[PDB]
Design a protein around this ligand. Structure first.
Ligand SMILES: Nc1ncnc2[nH]cnc12
Ligand SMILES: Nc1ncnc2[nH]cnc12
Ligand SMILES: Nc1ncnc2[nH]cnc12
Ligand SMILES: Nc1ncnc2[nH]cnc12
Ligand SMILES: Nc1ncnc2[nH]cnc12
Ligand SMILES: Nc1ncnc2[nH]cnc12
Ligand SMILES: [Cl-]
Ligand SMILES: [Cl-]
Ligand SMILES: [Cl-]
Ligand SMILES: [Cl-]
Ligand SMILES: [Cl-]
Ligand SMILES: [Cl-]
Lengths: 239, 239, 239, 239, 239, 239
């Protein structure tokens, strides 16, 4: 038995760096730690949601899984900002696209995220509350990709509660308004950062074109991941 | 590289029994398999979401984690009913309560679940769609608890997207209408079972009284879990 | 002039039994009293909404009309639970069906009811509040039908405010999710029972198949009614 | 057994006049017929919902009960306009008031009605559809009251689904915006008249002041009714 | 620098008459003042939103532009009723129609207005609040047109936030329920008048048939305007 | 009579530059043209909504008023992007703030805007659609202010339909989530730019602190305007 600083995390207060990368898959968090962090230690394994703290190019950095969907990321991010006193979270993810000018393997940097969830209406008296990335975070991601000569798409994501959509007309509306990324979490993250006066952003790679059915092979997803993670890691040095 | 029958599960079609127990924590799924299943094999580990198939008292039974929140359980349950041809899912969970006559350690059998999620409005043209447990499943749980001489509370749950509620008046309304369990997933499960012409139910143990702040110790949570899981396992023999 | 214990009921406090059957048509309430109750007296005739109190197999039982729609049943049921101190109400009704495996003359026992009304959102801070039958009531109805060798369908109803629907896609969604009964009142009854810590259920007979246009003749509706009412009456002995 | 032209009315097509008065209480419909119509015959008694057709000062006129709430009046009025080819319906009712300058016994002529029902949003793509009385009907009521030297209040009603309101702040908002009448049906009537290219209005007498708790005695309600019904009857001669 | 009695109006308190005509186009307000008012002075030019005060047939009358859309008219009308102590506002506008029996050049007198705006839900606890014209104002407009032998259509308007509609099915629903006028402001005006215990109405001329594409030429719009404005001006003498 | 390319703009197609600054007050548009544009001509005066086209430091640039509120800016911006083929619109405005660390005279660069309007839900199947500024526009504004040594606040705006708010709790929620600017138009602009595959942004100066009641004097508003307009003009050179 270890003392539990939160109901979902056994890390001691102070065991997370002020900057954290988060991805849905805890096994990918372990890969990030093993392949890119130094001075690394595992700080959480509750519910299998692996988290790690170390350094990237000497600067403190943590990485942890967030699970799938807005309610899951909301638990983990609320705890990180509130109990662990984290200042910056960058979600590092995968996404689909409907945009005709976005292609599988593209790197998407998210400026704001729409949603079919109610969580943000509940925060703003039933009104429209845009889940908005912090500008310094967006800029750090854009500038890191430029320095690395990796092209990026910059624009809106859409975070859905329903992976297995049955909703007629949704893809056409997302395309009409140039949503570049379809995923499941970022719209839950940004308002929590706001509540705590903290910062968040999101970068994703396109695994699937929802319209054309193009899909990245395993090797292509590894190459896309390597590009995205290098951008995110370099961006942390500016944050 | 293994063939992926779904984007989130590496099990081969046929590797799940027709009856599945699911809990949020994949590590608890492993405990259930190790302590209660025979003939057991691990059939999934994608995203750390451990799943297992074996037998309980000779009858095929699987157990798998579902993660936290409606979007997470929706992914896993949709796949189980659709691709894996599962017929019955029982969620085996923990919950809070606001009800003045429900106490920590109590076992709650869920007849229907409210929610603050939009997922069910989206299925029924914006209207009220009650997330409703199958009657045969509820009855099997009630009758198994009676045969085991374990008291139960039977009634409504409330599945929220927001573990860290900031909503004034919610607890008072839940208590006024005798909601017995507050959790995060069951309202997403029941309508998916309906879509597939299949069955679902939920049984939870009370870990926390949201009003009085009573909370179960680790030893008390183990005892509650042992009672709940025996009820669920015996119920599968009737299903 | 008689003293009015409520604005809609001239019965004296205590003039209703703790268990009440209610149907939409007050003339059917009179038929139930005349054909199945002993020791019977009329206790209300305000607005023509006939109500009666007597005994069924020696046990106190009342029967009263509720009129058509959620607002009408809400008035009468609120008064019964609050002023008349009733403990159990069973709605005994007729319904349509869209379900391909439900047929005209079938007896449907309701576990929960959806709706297009706002009344339940207004009770639960705008959220989804499932109108849920009490499990002991559902079980008593199921077991009484079994003892009488009368087949039943058990599952969800949908209570609409609009008998003359013009809503495209509604029937297809109701069928997709296996709603067995379409009627107009039960979703208003169950939350009122909850408010008062009391019990409610509903049993209906299928008069019409909304898809195939099959419709019960007058003789068939009498036979269906005789089956349903015997089930409900026998169930009261267990409640 | 009689042929049923609708599921709720045994009147033969043509048995209703083109102008119909409707009140909630079928027993009050009988009183109106007995005391004010000549050449009168009962044309419906299904569900006890008495309806009558005769003449008032030589002009064809019917009167029928509508029951309590929007779903009930919607059934009866839809049938009257569609099957019975009625052209004008005037609801003749009772109401409460919150308005500080409206008093018990006052006669209120309704120009439009708000609601907490969803029925009108469902007709207009989810938008705000004002339930609006026909101007010729309103004018006929106003001018008849003037000729009879009976004072009237003219303005908005509010039609609620919930007689037993638990809603904090509702009365204060209704008063702030000068709603003169609180009742349960008119907002359902006016849009149905619109659908059929027909006309509707409403006149009510104040039985209760919701704020001060003033309440009309039985004798006072009879006097108020006599004033209101004379206004409505005289108005039919202009319609 | 002049003292600003409101943030949008430089008129001194008392510089507006108790009765005000308002139109969207400030240049049309100037035309009305120049061609129909005597004793006229310009009292506002902030934001170009010209307003004037003078007399019509000896009676004090003002005219001012209101701009386009509910938020714009709401600013100006709130200020007029609150700061300037205005008692009656008549909107004098143009509109489209979908109604098959309404034609270009017709004069429409508005009894109530629907909307796709949220402003009225926000005033009435999320419910349906009909934006309703004052009956004395409607009657004054109707009677003035009759005395001038100018035909009118009387009925509902629909005030939209979106001139450039992309909404499938809207026109068909508006036609089904006999909305006579499509415009952008009146639904915002009427509830503000209510808040202040004051009066409002609206009269419009049909510039365009939304279905047939008929459109008034410039000369036809001038003739329609001359008819409408004479009706409105004469109506002010009765108010 | 001039040909009207749109119902609200007499400019000939081609008479607007590809980049346009817009402000609410047409008189401020004239001031911008007179004081900062060369080669300038007035291209619109319909409804007094002055618009001008010229050059700023040799590059084509237009400036036009947009009026007050989402419906007004939506008309003008839709026309500019669609008929006039504009590529970039920057709203140059004033705002209030509730943020404790934002002060009167501050320059706010908007990354996204919330709203109480329905216009964006109507574009995205009822879901949350964030009104999001284009990143290149935001960056151009930020970098221009830096080069000019003018401090800026960067973050979310809130666009309301109701200048005269009566909404309890709104300011506290806006402050909790660090909304920096309260205004009335930007949330309508950004989705229209998206529809046309075009770009938009917004920069405002704080005229009023909604909490402390601090308010800029006329001289202070002129100084703030001079800072903001120089930032916007310099940003156009990068766009
Ligand atoms: N198509 C998709 N939909 C939702 N979330 C996703 N994450 C990756 N691809 C996705
Ligand atoms: N208090 C609580 N709220 C939500 N989900 C829970 N699961 C267990 N306890 C819970
Ligand atoms: N088709 C139907 N729709 C609604 N309520 C009903 N009650 C009986 N049949 C019905
Ligand atoms: N107070 C009230 N509320 C609702 N409907 C009514 N009808 C008469 N009085 C009423
Ligand atoms: N077609 C139309 N739509 C909206 N407002 C209008 N005003 C005049 N014509 C209109
Ligand atoms: N306080 C305020 N509210 C809304 N819009 C504004 N524009 C400038 N100040 C404002
Ligand atoms: Cl996924
Ligand atoms: Cl949890
Ligand atoms: Cl019916
Ligand atoms: Cl009543
Ligand atoms: Cl217009
Ligand atoms: Cl303003």
């Amino acid at each position: 038995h270890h003392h539990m600083a939160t109901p979902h995390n056994s890390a001691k207060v102070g065991d997370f760096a002020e900057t954290v990368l988060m991805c849905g898959d805890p096994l990918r968090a372990k890969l990030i730690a093993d392949n890119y962090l130094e001075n690394a230690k595992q700080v959480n394994s509750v519910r299998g949601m692996l988290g790690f703290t170390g350094t990237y190019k000497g600067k403190p950095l943590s990485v942890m899984g967030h699970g799938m969907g807005i309610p899951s990321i909301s638990i983990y991010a609320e705890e990180l900002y509130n109990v662990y006193k984290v200042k910056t979270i960058i979600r590092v993810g995968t996404c689909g696209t409907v945009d005709p000018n976005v292609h599988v393997r593209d790197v998407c940097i998210v400026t704001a995220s729409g949603t079919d969830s109610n969580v943000n209406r509940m925060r703003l008296l039933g009104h429209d509350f845009p889940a908005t990335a912090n500008f310094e975070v967006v800029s750090a991601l854009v500038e890191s990709a430029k320095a690395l000569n990796i092209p990026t798409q910059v624009g809106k994501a859409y975070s859905t509660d329903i992976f297995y959509s049955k909703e007629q007309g949704l893809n056409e509306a997302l395309a009409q308004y140039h949503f570049i990324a379809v995923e499941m979490e970022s719209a839950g993250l940004f308002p929590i950062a706001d509540y705590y006066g903290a910062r968040a952003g999101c970068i994703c790679t396109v695994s699937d074109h929802i319209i054309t059915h193009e899909s990245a092979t395993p090797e292509e997803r590894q190459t896309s991941f390597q590009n995205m993670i290098k951008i995110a890691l370099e961006a942390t040095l500016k944050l």
